[PDB]
Amino acid sequence: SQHGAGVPHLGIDPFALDYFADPYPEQETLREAGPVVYLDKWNVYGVARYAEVYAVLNDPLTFCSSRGVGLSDFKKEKPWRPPSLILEADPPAHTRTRAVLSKVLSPATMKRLRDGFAAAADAKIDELLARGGNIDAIADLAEAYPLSVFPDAMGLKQEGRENLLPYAGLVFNAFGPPNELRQSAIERSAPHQAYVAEQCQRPNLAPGGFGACIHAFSDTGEITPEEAPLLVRSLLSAGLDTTVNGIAAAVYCLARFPDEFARLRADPSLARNAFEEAVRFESPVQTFFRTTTRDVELAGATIGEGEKVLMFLGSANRDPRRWDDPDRYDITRKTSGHVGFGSGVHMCVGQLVARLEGEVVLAALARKVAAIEIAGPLKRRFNNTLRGLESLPIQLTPA
């Protein structure tokens, strides 16, 4: 390896705590430096503009996922857990396991489940207003709401559910480099991993839920009985804390930007796009990696075989080369093509679940709430892959 000959090198640590606290100046530096940069801190290439993020995402055989989508290269180091059969696979293996999850989380499934999700969101906003409206948008809403619907939709038992958010925090930290956040999460992981490992098994998943639906594909031969609990493991990894942070992004956006909330109230049919624009704007899933499978030319750079490439999805989603006024939260923006859910063959399989949760929460706010205001100090949460808040006191004014 030439280790980044011919491209600009930068010392920016995109996994440093001061960076997660305020990433936007360094994301701009990463974009301005060039289309391809080399990050000295971790000896990986980086792409922070929309054009190259999009190109890498849409070339999955060249920029592969089967050597891990975190920093660690699975060819060189044993993975911290056995690889995801969907996220950390390439076609054709990826095609067959993705197709199972695309059927489980299908658009018709979302329509059959819609009233359950919407009634829970209505009831939650009612509860928050009956409390007086002075509530923590994180604990009381962004966290509480997905906890009230997703474990039941999975068919998980009641007991042990406190393990779910720590498990997700661990998975998202573990894509990161071997820093304190990662080391510490892995050290405390055993009980969370054990809980998950157990709940993925068929006898532990209630009939009618997503878990049992996956396991049914083993009965028809479409997957094996040892694949089935791993595909359940994917949904327990990615299905809860992503939506918590996307809901948090949406509430935080609407709270800061009252004119946009008033627009949402005027036309509640903007709920879906308001949620999608929050996903662009905050990019709750900030980064993933790929690994080159061959020597490649990317935007003028040479990249050797077997190099990690860090994609900055959150910077791509704010890149002024692609987005008009990228730092504005605009709930009528044409958001199509943002990379907050990825792009191409691995584009979020659960996006219909995430959008259903976000829509129903925003629709309940649009109908029941006259105004939203930040009410007290916020506290940001640091995670190697996720962006979002630990606390956000708000005031909801009832309609």
Ligand-binding annotation for 81, yes or no, is: yes
Q: Is 84 annotated as a binding residue?
A: yes
Nearer to ligand HEM, 86 or 138 (CB): 86
Residue from 237, 287, 291, 335 touching ligand ANN (CB under 6 A): that is 237
* CB 78, CB 329: distance < 8 Å: no
What is the residue-wise DSSP string for 14-33? TTSHHHHHS-HHHHHHHHHH
Output the CA–CA distances (angstroms, integers) from residue 187 to 183, 193, 228, 386, in the order listed: 6, 11, 27, 19
348 assigned to a ligand binding site:
yes
Closest to Cl ion by CB, 173 or 193: 193
Between residues 163 and 193, which has the closer beta carbon with respect to Cl ion?
193
Work out how close the CB of 109 gets to ligand HEM at its nearest, in angstroms, rounded to a whole number.
11
Under rule CB under 6 A, residue 196 binds ligand ANN: no
Minimum distance, C-beta of residue 168 to ligand ANN, in the bound complex (Å): 8
Q: Which of 54, 175, 288, 382 binds ligand HEM (CB under 6 A)?
A: 288
| Distance from C-alpha of 167 to C-alpha of 383, rounded to nearest angstrom | 13
Torsion of CA 256, 257, 260, 265, to 10 degrees: 50
CB of 293 to Cl ion, least distance (A): 26
State the Rg of the chain over Cα: 21
The reply on whether position 171 binds ligand ANN by CB under 6 A is: yes
C-beta atoms surrounding 399 within 10 Å: 12
SS3 sequence of 142-202: HHHHHHHHHHHHHCCCCCCHHHHHHHHHHHHHHCCCCCHHHHHHHHCCHHHHHHHHHHCCH
Count of beta carbons in the 10 Å neighbourhood of residue 397: 11
The phi, psi pair for 100, rounded to 5°, reads -65, -50
Q: Which of 34, 35, 284, 393 binds ligand HEM (CB under 6 A)?
A: 284
The tokens of 34 are what? Answer: 């060039």
Q: Which residue from 97, 234, 286, 384 is in contact with ligand ANN, where contact means CB under 6 A?
A: 234
**Helical H segments across 188-294, by residue range:** 190-199, 210-216, 227-238, 241-256, 258-266, 271-282
Q: Which of residues 147-166 bind ligand HEM (CB under 6 A)?
A: none
Give, as ranges, the residues between 276 and 305 that touch ligand ANN (CB under 6 A).
285
Furthest-apart CA atoms within the chain: distance in Å = 63
CB of residue 268 to ligand HEM, shortest distance in Å: 20
Partner from ligand ANN, Cl ion, ligand HEM, none binding residue 396, C-beta < 5-8 Å depending on class: none
Taking the CA of residue 350 as centre, how many other CA atoms within 13 Å lie in the half-sphere pointing to its CB? 23
Q: Give least dist CB 42 to Cl ion, A.
A: 24
Sign of CA dihedral 335, 14, 31, 294: negative
* Site residue total, ligand HEM (CB under 6 A): 28
Ramachandran quadrant class, 3 (left: phi over 0; alpha: psi -120 to 50; beta: rest): left
Among 39, 53, 55, 86, binds ligand ANN (CB under 6 A): 86
Residue 214 contacts residue 206 (beta carbons within 8 Å): no
Minimum distance of ligand ANN from residue 351's CB (angstroms)? 10
Q: Is 193 in the site for Cl ion (CB under 5 A)?
A: yes
Find residue 9's DSSP bridge partners. Answer: 38
Annotated binding residue 234: yes
Of 16-24, 110-118, 236-244, 311-319, the window that binds ligand ANN (rule: CB under 6 A) is 236-244
Partner whose binding site includes residue 193, from Cl ion, ligand HEM, ligand ANN, none (CB under 5 to 8 Å by kind) = Cl ion
Q: Is 283 one of the annotated binding-site residues?
A: no
Write the binding mask 66 to 105 for Cl ion: x where contact by CB under 5 A, - elsewhere: ---------------x------------------------
Q: Which residues lie near Cl ion (CB under 5 A)?
A: 81, 193
Q: Which residues are annotated as a binding site for heme?
A: 348
Positions that interact with ligand ANN (CB under 6 A): 84, 86-87, 171, 234, 237-238, 242, 285
In the complex, the residues that contact ligand HEM under the rule CB under 6 A are: 65, 69, 86-87, 98, 101, 105, 234-235, 238-239, 242-243, 246, 279, 284-285, 288, 313, 340-342, 346, 348-350, 353-354
